[PDB]
Amino acid sequence: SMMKWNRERRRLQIEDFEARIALMPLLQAEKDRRVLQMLRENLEEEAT
Amino acid sequence: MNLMLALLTNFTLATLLVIIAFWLPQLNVYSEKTSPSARLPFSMKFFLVAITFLLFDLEIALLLPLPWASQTANLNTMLTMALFLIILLAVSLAYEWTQKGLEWTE
Amino acid sequence: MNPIIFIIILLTIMLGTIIVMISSHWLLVWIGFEMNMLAIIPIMMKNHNPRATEASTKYFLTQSTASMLLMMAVIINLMFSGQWTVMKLFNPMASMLMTMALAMKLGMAPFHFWVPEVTQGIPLSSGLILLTWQKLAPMSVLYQIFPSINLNLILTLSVLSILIGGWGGLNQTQLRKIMAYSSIAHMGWMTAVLPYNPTMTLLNLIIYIIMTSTMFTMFMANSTTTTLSLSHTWNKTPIMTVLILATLLSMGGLPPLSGFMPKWMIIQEMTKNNSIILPTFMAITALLNLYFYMRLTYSTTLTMFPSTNNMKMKWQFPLMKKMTFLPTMVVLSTMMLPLTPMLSVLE
Amino acid sequence: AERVAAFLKNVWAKEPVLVASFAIAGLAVILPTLSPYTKYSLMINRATPYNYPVPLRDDGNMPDVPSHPQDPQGPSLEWLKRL
Amino acid sequence: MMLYIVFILSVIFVMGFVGFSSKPSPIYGGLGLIVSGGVGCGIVLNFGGSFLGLMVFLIYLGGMMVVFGYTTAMATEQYPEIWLSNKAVLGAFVTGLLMEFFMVYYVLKDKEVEVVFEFNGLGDWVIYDTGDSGFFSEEAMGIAALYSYGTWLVIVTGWSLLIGVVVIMEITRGN
Amino acid sequence: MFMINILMLIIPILLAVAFLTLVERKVLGYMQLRKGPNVVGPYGLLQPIADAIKLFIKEPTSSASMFILAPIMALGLALTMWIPLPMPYPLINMNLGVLFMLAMSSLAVYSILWSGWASNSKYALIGALRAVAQTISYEVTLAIILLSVLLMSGSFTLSTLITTQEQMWLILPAWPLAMMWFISTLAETNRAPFDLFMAEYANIIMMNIFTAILFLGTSHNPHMPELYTINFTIKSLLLTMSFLWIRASYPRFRYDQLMHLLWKNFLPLTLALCMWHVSLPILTSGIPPQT
Amino acid sequence: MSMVYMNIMMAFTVSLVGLLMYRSHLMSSLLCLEGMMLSLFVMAALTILNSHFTLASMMPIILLVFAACEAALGLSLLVMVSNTYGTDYVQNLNLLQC
Amino acid sequence: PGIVELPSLEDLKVQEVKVSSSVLKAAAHHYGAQCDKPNKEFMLCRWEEKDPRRCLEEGKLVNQCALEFFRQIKRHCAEPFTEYWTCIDYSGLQLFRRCRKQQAQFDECVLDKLGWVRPDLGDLSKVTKVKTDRPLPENPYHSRARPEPNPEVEGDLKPARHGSRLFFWTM
Ligand SMILES: CCCCCCCCCCCCCCCCCC(=O)OC[C@H](COP(=O)(O)OCCN)OC(=O)CCCCCCCCCCCCCCCCC
């Protein structure tokens, strides 16, 4: 019984990981724009 | 923060319950009661038991990552090294056992 | 000890040293030292007496201090280079710490005070391992980190060791005390030449081990541990006094014996780099070692000290000690000078 | 033999705890080698995607690399569902 | 103030070290090492080392220091000494705390001090990483790699622990 | 809002421990053909209150500090053990909750050492050293057994033991481990037949709560969390009652015999079963997910 | 370097001086030898964890196992010293002066 | 050293996907099969270029394909999707296996009103290939020239001239 259930749990984890992989590009794109925007903001107050 | 708050409460409450338990009794003001080398000696058996615990405990720390170790693609190496660590954990005991390290007769 | 356990413990002493010699990772170097120290404490206690326990404790405290400084130097090196490779260190403070850790592990002056006491406190067989096999692992590390070692530090230690070892031996009547101070003085030669030519540090290590093993083997054959007990040897095994004379003259660096060869090659390597004062001072100071070796030959081979009546009863029995490789060791210790060019095999 | 069945029968009578321990440890060491399902353990560990699957630049001669996640090409987990 | 919890934790780390380094009776000596060990785990926790920090409690404190106190109770005086009641023990404690307090003053005032190495007092958070959203713990993956990558580490570490048992039985037998 | 949660955990624990003393005396009594407390309050329900008041107004060392630290450490660490317990939601959700409890449980041996040390009696000290040796010896099997169980679970998370046992209790695949675990907890809590007060009885409940989670997992329905708590409470209560049941029915071990019970029976068997449970998921292809 | 390093390096130095400056109990010096290890564990773990050097994550564990194995050997020697003299005083270990 | 180049705030602007994490999780499987092309081009850019600045345009098309994806759902399948991600959002772990009924209703909705097929197990984890026109980054690490190697000692090994030539030795 433990073997059957653990196999079923590995399949659910693969699905859980695959939902993340589908979303990683969109999160990666927004992370890039937040890092650069924060760096650009810091550069302005640095100039002043 | 939650963990630090919980630990602080647990050990603050223990501290309060300990000091007042040391002071609430002095409310009674009970009458004063007139009650006027470096080895215990210690037996070497009670030392060996502690040291054997320490050395086995160290070999347990080596095994603790076992649940994570089973997730690797190199399962043949992982399994061989896991059974190696446990077996030498047994070999140590068998040496203790056969050399009377686990006895209590003096 | 049970003989099987004794063998396994000796192979762990060897395994720890080999781990240090074959490792390209600093953690495995540390582990080899830790394993090596762990297995050598047993053989030091194996006769069970207050003196053997004092020696083992003084050894443990000294070696444990050295390993924590070695680990501290390894971690500083990691912080400043982000890598673990056994090679030159990337921080001068890491180099000072490692050099002092290895100096402590070798017993070099001024980290020398444990060597005479620990050696006197254990058996001759255990002392042989302490003064011979134990030098390999620290030496093989100094061999690889030398391009970053501070020259004033390594040369300061070496000169101090040649002085402390030479002077300390003059006042000794215990053979294990004499050998310990001889070991200190000889370490000073191996590290003096290390910044200039590490090959001549290996040459002096090999030859010093061969002659030191020959001495201990000969002391073990007759179970002699004091000057006066050794002075009876002429009246039991006259052959042994001749070999003792020859080996002691060799350790003194007198030509044409093999012990002259390392001192010869180091002076050559130091002058090539325009070090004239230091080798002159070093070579003269080594005359102290020859003096208290010469004293030993006077009471053993060149005169006949008074004997005892009960020595007559020993004449009827043969030597049964194994004396392994003694015939080969004594011939490498005395007759190897003509083959000096063969030192290139160590290149 | 029979000199051995008498040995085993003696330990089973005097030290049942150790006979069990040495039986379980032998099974632990031996069974993984003889099991037909030990291969599926490697595959399932190899099939779990922890990292992002970085695409390959399509030079023009990668016939077996799919162009879309739902394309027929590439490895499949069909065995995993039935298993 | 919580932004310098790692620096505040490391100050108590040093005070606990001054505690047992000044060497009171070996019973308060072991109490100072327990407090530092626990505070030392706290620092490792705040850097992402959950498993390493918990290995300190489980192994170092609940294993090694337990055996220290056990051994101390069996062969050491049995009677402690009032902490700081001895002149040398008190003189070293104040000396340590004075240097601990002086280092803390110049680093926080000047946001920098220079002792052998250069130290910058802007805070510890300033060096933290700004990129991770993996669905695993990197510490755990590094430690779990011991059984796959570290075949050689396990062998020598296993041998040393077996030999430790053999060695310690010989040392204490007495014949 | 978090402060209420920590209070809503501590106070019930102290009340539960207070009335565990009552249950102990009545359960032992009836197994001995008597009644136990039934005079102080109806069915004895006020007996714990009477004992508490009397204890704190009764009239009350080598090291003053250690005589104060010993009660705090035991009492503080006994309460700390409850913060990660999924009932079904933990107060503090830890990814290494199981590892946290082994760590805190290990520190419990200090109060024994300190209390014995602060006593000032050579005789008292050796009695503490015997108790410390019993505890650490039996901590070995708790750690190894727990590791063998976590190989079927997949992590150190305590709420993952709930998910591990969604279809079936771990007692069925691991009854040989559950047996040695249950005895090890009695030895760890120095309970009969291994007895060779608030913090002590808090551990007893907590260890049996941890036993129910480890081996008798209750199904959790996120829409009705209260059902899990009721079923969870019943399982832990009966496990706690079995401690009382065991105490009434057995004589005591000798000290050398309980050391022999572990070093020569549990540890050899606990090691083998650890080997077995590392191999079994690999050879059956039932390795649990890492997350 | 960062600020926390100042104190972890301060703690190693403190326990180093405490180790080299003995008093009487040999136990008090073994604790200084374990304070040094504790500081080196924390120093290493901060370096390895901050730099994200994944495979080095097991270095602190190995360092903790070996040093504890060392302390087990050190305590054994202390206990054997205690047998011969009834105390762990370091001034009773002076036979080898001659 | 030079001045770290930074694109101005005007270039970093784009219409965000302002839906919570459980909304993304519920659409993630369909999202990864519908927006795969622009998604994979952006990720190939990031790994190839190793620079968030060199892939700011590709990252804007990721938002554009994502916003369009969520409008397809809002136009045809709003209620089945709202009912579904509201079930996911309840769980602390946001577990898929707790909402298989609501997931089903969402799947027939899109498979009838849009023609979408949920990718099978293992599909989104394939390594695929992307046709791109962006030129391959030739020196992504901005390496300097590598130092020249030392000359290769070559030739025949003749015996040493007159032997070792050590002091007086003639061999
Ligand atoms: C090889 C190239 C380099 C050349 C350098 C020279 C190398 C030579 C040294 C290498 C090692 C060889 C050692 C030689 C051993 C000689 C032993 C010997 O000849 O007999 C010693 C003698 C025998 O005694 P006994 O046991 O009674 O036997 C009687 C027989 N029935 O015992 C006695 O009777 C007692 C003797 C009294 C003590 C005399 C002391 C003087 C000994 C001089 C020889 C040693 C010289 C060594 C230095 C080298 C010299 C150049």
Ligand SMILES: CCCCCCCCCCCCCCCCCC(=O)OC[C@H](COP(=O)(O)OCCN)OC(=O)CCCCCCCCCCCCCCCCC
């Ligand atoms: C077999 C594999 C295939 C499986 C298929 C099924 C077949 C099963 C066959 C198993 C046969 C195993 C037989 C082993 C019997 C044990 C040896 C023995 O007889 O020991 C007896 C002895 C008793 O000790 P004691 O009671 O103190 O003294 C006598 C007082 N009347 O005790 C001693 O002598 C001391 C011995 C102690 C060490 C034994 C326990 C090992 C350490 C614990 C680890 C257990 C796991 C095994 C690890 C080994 C590697 C796998």
